[PDB]
Design a binder for this molecule. Structure first.
Ligand SMILES: CC[C@H]1OC(=O)[C@H](C)[C@@H](OC(=O)NCCCOCCC#Cc2ccc3c(=O)c(C(=O)O)cn(C)c3c2)[C@H](C)[C@@H](O[C@@H]2O[C@H](C)C[C@H](N(C)C)[C@H]2O)[C@](C)(OC)C[C@@H](C)C(=O)[C@H](C)[C@H]2NC(=O)O[C@@]21C
Ligand SMILES: [Mg+2]
Lengths: 120, 215, 114, 122, 48
RNA sequence: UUGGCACCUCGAUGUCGGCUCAUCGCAUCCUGGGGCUGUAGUCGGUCCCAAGGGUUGGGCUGUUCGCCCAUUAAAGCGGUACGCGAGCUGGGUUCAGAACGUCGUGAGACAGUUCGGUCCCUAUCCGUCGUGGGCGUAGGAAAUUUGAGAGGAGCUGUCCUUAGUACGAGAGGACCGGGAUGGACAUACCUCUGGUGUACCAGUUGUCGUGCCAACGGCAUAGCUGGGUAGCUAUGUGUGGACGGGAUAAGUGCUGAAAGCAUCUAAGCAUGAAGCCCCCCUCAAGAUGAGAUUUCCCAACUUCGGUUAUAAGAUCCCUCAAAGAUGAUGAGGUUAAUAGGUUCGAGGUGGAAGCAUGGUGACAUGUGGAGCUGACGAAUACUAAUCGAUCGAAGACUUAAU
């Protein structure tokens, strides 16, 4: 696996935060290396969501941050609830994938290959 | 006398007749085919070329060594064989006991022969003088600033130069090594595997050239 | 599994006449000692300390006290030199390797049955 | 793995209660030893009396070590303490008993009186 | 650990023979015909 | 070595010991071959040939040296700016402080002691260790190659047998060869023994937070503690220096005369060493002499090739690791298992959650070797290697055979 030029605690934190944000937005923009490394984490969380049993819920609560989404009509529900009620159904029949990645050109401030990781 | 191209799978252990633990390496020799029979008047030295494994056949627009190229298909079709992945030759063999197109099988080896396995070492990459050359390194305390670097590279004004062969840092690995006087413990003809006492050079999934000890 | 060719070429060396046990169980391993001019048997008695990866490569360790001097013997599980293993009595532990018995002597090294 | 400046217990009634080593016989540059190997050593704690007294230089044989030994079948024998026994330059002990277990590998080294005068051969 | 002498213009220009930028890996985009980097999304159109 | 001379260096050539790394001579310390002896063999002494390899660990001093304690087959002598400080130390010595003894009325002094006392430098060139690109090898390519050369190894102990034999009043005691095991050292590898394993498992303290109990997350060296997969590793596992040729050294001869004898010599022809050459391991056609074998590709405009673009072949680009600083090498790019995910498994950890039972409680038991599980094995196109682009032959003369 990759280290992302960062320590262990700071990476653990970055990976879980990036996975949460992806789950919120359903497509985000970042650099290749971190997309390649958040792919597995988000894919595994969705797996914890395709079962929905209380054990998997409690276990997926480890990674996701506690965030609130305001849906249409001022309806509110958290990241766990999204994962287990709006994304489990979408991928009940698909047996992998769950994400795609679309390389983009280098950014300006660096030569970093920005990419967009999106939930498929 | 005998030679087979194989690849290394791993190491395990077997127990011997009197209970002894035998350390072993599993080598997989399958579809070894003779592709030529070099001759003294045709090429200047008598030997035979063996192709191992099996590539796929030519395809237009290939982008990898998976498939054979037109040049290799032709070489192998002259021996009515499939394109192969690794090709080596053997000199110790009697060229007249082989035919262009035969299969060399694992059973060429009987239990208790003496063989030499020639492979390539594992790559360690760029390394320094203590790992690459076994050098004693300096003191780690008592106010030292010479921890792992190599020591003097020469003398002084006499030989105002560094002599060739001075053991300095660089790439380690990627060298052909021949371990000598190993032996085979069992030959299995169905899974096509020659088991060799000891350990052999190389990464897992590599290539070993087993032949009969020259000593 | 492990590599399939490794597992195939070494399947014949595995023993099946052996019982099932776990670290913490005290047991009697019997061994063909071919010492002198006889194949005798020495009933070695100890407490299993650990055991390792499967295949012919599984090895287990047993600990005893000889004359107030701790002795530990590692044995390959499928060694043909072991006639039989009797789990002389079971053992309630909470580890998989019992390294922490190298500092205790006497009742401190106590084990509950079952 | 026993090298010089290593303190060993004596497993005998020679007088010596505990000794340390200077060399490992057997070769130029030899550095270590295991069961069945002889070492030069000087006692550091003697019993009041005994045939061997404090500060003497003596030949001695290793009978049990914590590093222990591999046997040809893949069996390993390890111990909880280093130990040694004094010898009389004939592979024979200086004392009359021998305390504690001993490893079977001493049979080969023809330390038979050591193997015969022992609580447990192993 | 200091330059014992000057590096002449000849030596200088010689060392930097291999010091150059490579033309980009660009291919034409199938929806718009403008060039894009290979394996990247066209920035003019937004396709594949 | 102690000196003599003052020839280069005072717009600076760091000086002694130790550490790291060696390299070369042989007037050889061990090992190999011999002549001998006031050599019965083991013993020793002497001289000759021999430099291939090897030629310890400590106590004491800043010490080189030397002495001492244990070993070894031996613990060799020297050169290399008394090798090596832009590789290291800085104990001694040689700045300023201080102090004792001595000399000086005194300031101070002593190569008399003593305690303390700042070791800078980002490597341009040559050199050296690795690793790329270009071009040449009379076409363009893919693979296998011989070996001109070059490098690496090169050490040796003990035991048993012959044999208690030869030889010995005895005491003692092989030569040869033929077996067996070591030491040191070099290599390859992780199956075993261990080490480490900061995205594996588990227990636990303080504190903050997800309202709350229960569950969990952040921080405290990874908070700590017990384990531990892959990888990487030694102290761990195998292997190696085994034969055997050819020419020799001191030496030993054979036939043999000058010199009808002799005599190893002059013709010739023998034997003889860890030494030389080969043998064994590795690199090697930039070996500009550029070598060899097999295969693949083969047209059609010219207005005359100083020709397109294309073959065969690669590369760009992208998924990767048995490879890696980068670039290279190697496994793959949909006609696809290259990597991710999913499913199953190995190995690791050790009895998840929620329930029900029992306890006042701290907890325990069954579910259920359960739950979790980074690299390890297999299957599966679910996701990404979609699209495309660039480079790359048309084969010279001369002569001889055909
Ligand atoms: C940190 C960067 C600076 O580097 C340095 O300080 C290094 C460390 C220095 O190394 C050395 O000390 N010798 C190596 C250590 C030698 O130990 C033996 C025991 C002693 C002594 C001693 C004797 C007398 C006096 C003295 O009498 C007195 C007073 O006060 O009178 C003051 N003390 C201290 C004395 C002490 C440089 C390199 C030094 O050169 C060297 O000196 C010698 C004169 C000759 C050397 N060679 C020619 C043989 C030479 O190589 C200099 C003089 O530095 C003082 C360098 C000069 C150019 C500088 O000034 C530079 C700018 C430094 N200044 C600074 O700031 O950066 C520096 C680079
Ligand atoms: Mg000057």
């Amino acid at each position: 696996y990759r280290k992302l030029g960062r320590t262990s605690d700071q990476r653990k934190a970055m990976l879980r935060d990036l996975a949460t944000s992806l789950i919120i937005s359903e497509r985000i923009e970042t650099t290749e290396a971190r997309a390649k490394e958040v792919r597995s984490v988000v894919e595994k969380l969705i797996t914890l969501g395709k079962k929905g049993d209380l054990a998997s819920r409690r276990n997926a609560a480890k990674t996701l941050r506690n965030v609130e989404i305001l849906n249409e009509d001022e309806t509110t529900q958290t990241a766990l609830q999204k994962l287990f009620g709006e994304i489990a159904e979408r991928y009940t029949e698909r047996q992998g994938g769950y994400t795609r990645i679309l390389k983009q050109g280098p950014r300006r401030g660096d030569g970093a290959e920005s990419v967009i990781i999106e939930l498929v | 006398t005998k030679g087979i191209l194989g690849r290394k799978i791993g190491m395990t252990q077997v127990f011997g007749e009197n209970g002894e633990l035998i350390p072993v390496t599993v080598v997989e020799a399958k579809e070894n085919v003779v592709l030529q029979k070099k001759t003294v008047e045709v090429d200047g030295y008598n030997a035979i070329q063996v192709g191992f494994e099996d590539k796929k056949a030519y395809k237009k627009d290939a982008k990898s060594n998976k498939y054979a190229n037109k040049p290799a298909e032709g070489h192998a079709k002259k021996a009515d064989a499939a394109p192969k992945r690794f090709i080596r030759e053997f000199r110790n063999v009697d060229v007249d006991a082989y035919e262009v197109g035969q299969e060399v099988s694992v059973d060429t080896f009987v239990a208790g022969d003496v063989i030499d396995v020639t492979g390539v070492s594992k790559g360690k990459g760029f390394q320094g003088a203590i790992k690459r050359h076994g050098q004693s390194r300096g003191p780690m305390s008592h106010g030292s600033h010479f921890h792992r670097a190599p020591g003097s590279v020469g003398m002084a004004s006499d030989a105002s130069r560094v002599f060739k062969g001075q053991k300095m840092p660089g790439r380690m690995g990627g060298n052909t090594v021949t371990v000598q006087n190993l032996e085979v413990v069992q030959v299995d003809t169905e899974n096509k595997v020659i088991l060799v006492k000891g350990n052999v050079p190389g990464p897992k999934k590599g290539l070993v050239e087993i032949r009969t000890s020259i000593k | 599994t492990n590599h399939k060719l490794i597992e195939a070429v070494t399947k014949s060396q595995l023993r099946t006449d052996l019982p099932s046990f776990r670290p913490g169980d005290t047991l009697r391993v019997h061994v063909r000692i071919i010492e002198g001019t006889r194949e005798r048997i020495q009933v070695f008695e100890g407490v299993v300390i650990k055991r390792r990866g499967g295949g012919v490569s599984e090895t287990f360790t047993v600990r005893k006290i000889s004359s107030g001097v701790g002795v530990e013997r590692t044995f390959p599980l499928h060694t043909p030199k072991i006639e039989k293993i009797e789990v002389k009595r079971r053992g309630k532990v909470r580890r998989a390797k019992l390294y922490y018995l190298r500092s205790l002597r006497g009742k401190a090294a106590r084990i509950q049955e079952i | 793995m026993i090298q010089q400046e290593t303190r060993l217990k004596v497993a005998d009634n020679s007088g010596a209660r505990e000794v340390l080593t200077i060399k490992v016989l057997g070769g130029s540059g030899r550095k270590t030893a295991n069961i069945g190997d002889v070492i030069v050593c000087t006692v550091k704690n003697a019993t009041p009396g005994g045939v061997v007294k404090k500060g003497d230089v003596v030949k001695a044989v290793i009978v049990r070590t914590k590093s222990g030994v591999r046997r040809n079948d893949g069996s390993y024998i390890k111990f909880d303490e280093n130990a040694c026994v004094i010898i009389r330059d004939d592979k024979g002990p200086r004392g009359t008993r021998i305390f504690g277990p001993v490893a079977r590998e001493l049979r080969e080294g023809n330390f038979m009186k050591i193997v015969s005068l022992a609580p447990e051969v192993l | 650990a200091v330059p014992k002498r000057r590096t002449s213009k000849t030596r200088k220009n010689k060392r930097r023979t291999h010091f150059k930028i490579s033309v980009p890996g660009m291919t034409e985009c199938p929806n718009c015909g403008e060039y894009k980097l290979s394996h990247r999304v066209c920035k003019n159109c937004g396709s594949y």
